[PDB]
């Protein structure tokens, strides 16, 4: 290996790739980063067994001789970041050793051969799903958080994504207490699919694909999914199994509706949480009457909250309903609309939230606690 | 019972300052609380963690209606206050040590405790104050605190030795018997002699508590603690008892070699040296000084090697090769504000000194090398 590259540009590509490398690796060799170089550019590869990133730096960069080597990720990344001048010269020598040279500083690191690094799977090469990056990042911010965090039921730790009739896109996540569903009609037909992707993997995707990347190509396989842009390949294992029916849970009718300013209600709920979080399963009680809406929390020997809430509008019947404020807090953080429409059926049935904006088909459900 | 209204932003700032003296975990449970005493002239907030105590007073915006005193869990109380909606908060104590906090349409009631459950402050005489400028005190701290020892095995090394001799010679020194940092100052006005050792962490908190808008502070001494006081802030610190080691006897007479480097570039070079030497426990860097040729070297049998030519400002004296733990030099350089640093070496096995290049301060640091 022999090539010279702009340091800054190199640190960015490396940081992105490092998102796929765990701090602790049960599989030793995976703590390393793969560096491959051919005549057209430098390709970095990191992995932790759940996700894999292949980032390509296209020839800021001039290559002298092709090659491949593995280096301890963090260690190497730290080193590169601390290099003197803007330019850096990478040159491999006998016994898989790399000689980095920048400014008046020269540092040699001992690597290992690529042969011992797991090879990537070949995900189906067919006409992928084309998705706009900001839409996918929007879907992720609205659903990933609703997925359960307990491995008790693995399937629920991911976001269920399904394409029907070659055009009806659905993304749903749930934890048996709250649910989030985003529906979208693609502008172009495409092959049907149905997968469950780890929430953690989706979060990384948003961190990896910067907003300068307009669209990504999506490819599917039974155990793995690939998100691909011009120079970045993001792989992730899928959660195998059957994701429960969720359409059945969609509340059709309601008895009460209240529209709130999203931000103001979130703050009131965060206020309630500070007190309710004092006990396990602590809840907030919402009292809805005509032109009077209040939140109440009572934590014996700790404190209590009594707060009157402002609303935009309301309809239907009066109602008193209790629930864990954290679910509502998180649901509101996911709603970018200035207002939020909340639909209730009764004190013991789930209530649903939709953006007052009506800019998208975004529905959330939260299950109340009976008192 | 307590009753006052206060500006939310003002309250939060004062609370977060006091919270600096309140530990996350507490062996003595009651120390997790913040003590609030309301008097005719202001609201005084007190926090302590067994090492330091902070009494911060908000002077009478703030409107006080009735006097009182109460204890509330600090972190919890502050998060609540910070979460209130309106610009102003009304605080009203009711029966059974409870306070009703009202801000806008939000009413939050909290359960508290009687102040008699809180330990009393070990008072310190307010007579014959030593007056020091805040920026000067903060400068001394940032230059010596880091050199103290963390090892509890020997308490005294954990603090910074501060001594005033001949009523005018001020000395602040700290060491980990590996490296040392010393600051000498001559007072313009004579003041009573003193000699104490202050826990280094307690000094770092001083800098965080007294904001720069505060020109000076009054310093009072007692055998067990020292009190730093501004107009509205009283900061107490427990003192480390014992005989501090004779550190004057460590200053090096002459030097055989001297080199002047750009403070920052040398720090950057040493940081790279650390990235490799750190791989090997007790890892060290090797400095090779010869006529117009200075270079750093590190060789880790596993991860890699370091060969770096060091740019210099000026040199003089004999050639020399010396090895030392880089982290020590890195930290010494971080403490030097001047563009350049002057390094004086003796033998490969003798401590080498560092002093600011602009020579505006009598700031000397000593670093013990490693016998290669």
Numbering used by the authors:
A (entry chain B): 2 to 60, 66 to 377
B (entry chain A): 1 to 60, 66 to 377
Quote from the publication.
The β subunit of the holoenzyme is required for efficient processivity in bacteria. Here we present the crystal structure of the β subunit of DNA polymerase III from Streptococcus pyogenes, a Gram-positive bacterium.
The crystal structure of the β subunit from Streptococcus pyogenes was determined by multiple anomalous diffraction (MAD) at 2.6 Å resolution using datasets for three separate wavelengths close to the selenium absorption edge. A model built into the phased electron density maps was refined subsequently to 2.1 Å resolution against native data. These crystals (space group P21) contain one β dimer in the asymmetric unit. Consistent with the structure of the E. coli β clamp, the S. pyogenes clamp dimer is formed in a head-to-tail fashion. Interestingly, the S. pyogenes β clamp dimer has a distorted oval shape, unlike the more circular shape of the E. coli β clamp. The longer of the outer oval diameters is ~90 Å while the shortest diameter across the clamp is ~65 Å. The overall organization of the S. pyogenes β subunit is very similar to that of the E. coli β subunit, with three distinct domains in each protomer. The interior of the central hole in the S. pyogenes clamp is lined with basic residues, many of which (e.g., Arg 8, Lys 25, Lys 143, Lys 206, Arg 272, and Lys 342) are conserved between the S. pyogenes and the E. coli proteins. In the closed form of the S. pyogenes β clamp, helix α1" displays an even larger displacement from ideal geometry in comparison to the E. coli β clamp. This distortion of the interface in the S. pyogenes clamp is correlated with the presence of the sidechain of Phe 81, which pushes against helix α1".
